[PDB]
Every structure is written in C-alpha cells, then in structure tokens.
C-alpha cells in the first residue's frame, strides 16, 4: 500500500470514505478542525475504482466520535480493513464495507480522535489514530 | 460485578492477575510506578476463588506494554474477559485463560498505559485503560 499520515489536529469535522459491499474500504479522507478552521486533509486514494463513497458530516464540535470499530480480513490474499463503523455521541455511521473477519474496536471513554495515519493500496491496509484531550 | 478504578499513575511495574482455563480471568492487581517509586494498587478480587495466580514483573522503566489483547466469551451465563495477553517491547506474557470467543486488542504506537479501571464479579466483566505520554 501507499503510506499516509495526516498528523494531529484540534478535532474532526467530516470523514469522506469509500467502500465496496463485497470487499473492503477504499479511499479515506478527513476534514479536520484546526483551531476553529476546517482543515481539508489530503484524499488518500485506493489504486482501484468501483467504490461507493460516503460522507460522514459531524456536527462539530458538539458531535464527536466515541467508538471506532470494524473488521480486518483477507481480500485477494491481503489482510485489509474490511469494514469501519463510527459511533458518535449522536448517532452511528456504518457499518461500511464487509462485516467479516477479525473484529476490532477502540471505544473512547475520555479524549478525542484527532488524526489518522495508515496505508491504502487496493484497500485500506491498516490504520492508526492519534488521541488527545 | 464490583466496579473499580485505579485512576492514573506514571507507569506500570507489575501486573498480577489470576485465571482459570475452564472459565475466565479472575483477580487483577497492578503495581504502578508513581514518580519513580512503586505504588501498590488495590487488589481487585473475584467473588469466588480457585484461580491460578500469575505475576508479570516488568523491567521498569525500560520495559513497557505495547499491546493488550484478549478474548471475551460467555461463562455460565456471564459475558466476561476469558483471556488476556500483554505484549511489551521485551516479550509476550500470555495468553492467560481460554482463547475462544470474540477477540479484542489495543495496540499502542505512541504513549503508555498508566491506569486500569473496570469491573469484576465472579470474573473480569470488562476493563478500560488510561493512556498518557
């Protein structure tokens, strides 16, 4: 995959991701907050097309993500992030992708996701999240 | 179960837990670091006894936990943490307890677990972790 690392920001305003209902997560992009201004993060793009795009537009700052969960699994022989679900204090976005394989979840009792890093080839290979108060 | 919350400290020196392979994780106690001196945490004990105790004695400060993983499953009608594994920069401790049910894992790319909270009844019902730089 091609590595990406947005770094850390003040918050999250919007997630623009793509998925295929038969395979895994493709493109991933985030509009962050940076000290009160929308920060358009770089669109991290799958090497392939065919995905269904999704726009998760949060009511920042009153709405914020409390749990990220999903599934990793083999697709074409690669372990990839097959599914993501974003649960906020207001509502649940997802599952997006295929809910199959090894499940994972990062619930947050206190604190904020303020950034993403990872790697995308044909699918989102892996990712990590910056946390902060 | 009886809730517990250690709060946050400077690091972790030792983890003391008990398990039974036929059931799940039983008791839990941490020896924390507090400002370069050992702080002996409260011993959080099951309602019952018969468990096998284990001591994980970390070479603090150079050894620290990089990943906490486990399995959750139903024991006699109770959905509990049936298995724990602690992976440090030096080695893996575990799995302790039955590795069947639904996996979870918290890998850490930067930062330190510095506290535990949760609940223990007959078994470890659930737990969360304090993270700091």
């Amino acid at each position: 995959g091609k590595a990406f690392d947005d770094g850390a920001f003040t918050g999250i305003r919007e997630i623009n991701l793509s998925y295929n209902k038969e395979t895994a997560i493709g493109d991933f992009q985030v509009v962050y907050d940076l000290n009160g201004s929308p920060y358009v993060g770089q669109n991290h793009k799958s090497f392939i097309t065919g995905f269904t795009p999704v726009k998760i537009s949060l009511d920042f700052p009153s709405e914020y993500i409390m749990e990220v969960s999903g599934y990793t699994g083999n697709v074409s022989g690669y372990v990839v992030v097959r599914s993501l679900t974003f649960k906020t204090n207001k509502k649940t976005y997802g599952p997006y992708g295929v809910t199959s394989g090894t499940p994972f979840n990062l619930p947050i009792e206190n604190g904020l996701i303020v950034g993403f890093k990872g790697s995308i080839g044909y699918w989102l290979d892996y990712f990590s999240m910056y946390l902060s108060l | 179960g009886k809730a517990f919350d250690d709060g946050a400290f400077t690091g972790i020196r030792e983890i003391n837990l008990s398990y039974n392979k036929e059931t799940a994780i039983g008791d839990f106690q941490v020896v924390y670091d507090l400002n370069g001196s050992p702080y002996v945490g409260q011993n959080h004990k099951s309602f019952i006894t018969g468990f096998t105790p284990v001591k994980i004695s970390l070479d603090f400060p150079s050894e620290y936990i990089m990943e906490v993983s486990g399995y959750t499953g139903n024991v006699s009608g109770y959905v509990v943490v049936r298995s724990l594994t602690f992976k440090t920069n030096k080695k893996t401790y575990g799995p302790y307890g039955v590795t069947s049910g639904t996996p979870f894992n918290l890998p850490i790319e930067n930062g330190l677990i510095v506290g535990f909270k949760g609940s223990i009844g007959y078994w470890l019902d659930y737990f969360s972790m304090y993270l700091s730089l």
Binding site: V81, G118, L124, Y126, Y130, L131, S132 | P107, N110, L133
Partner: peptide, 16 residues
Amino acid sequence: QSGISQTVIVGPWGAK
C-alpha cells in the same frame, strides 16, 4: 527532546 510536540497513537489495526 526536540521541538516536535507528541501525541498518543493507538493502532495499527489491519495488515501487520
């Protein structure tokens, strides 16, 4: 230290 500020990072999940 350096002049670069630090942040907790959890993960990764996915391909190892």
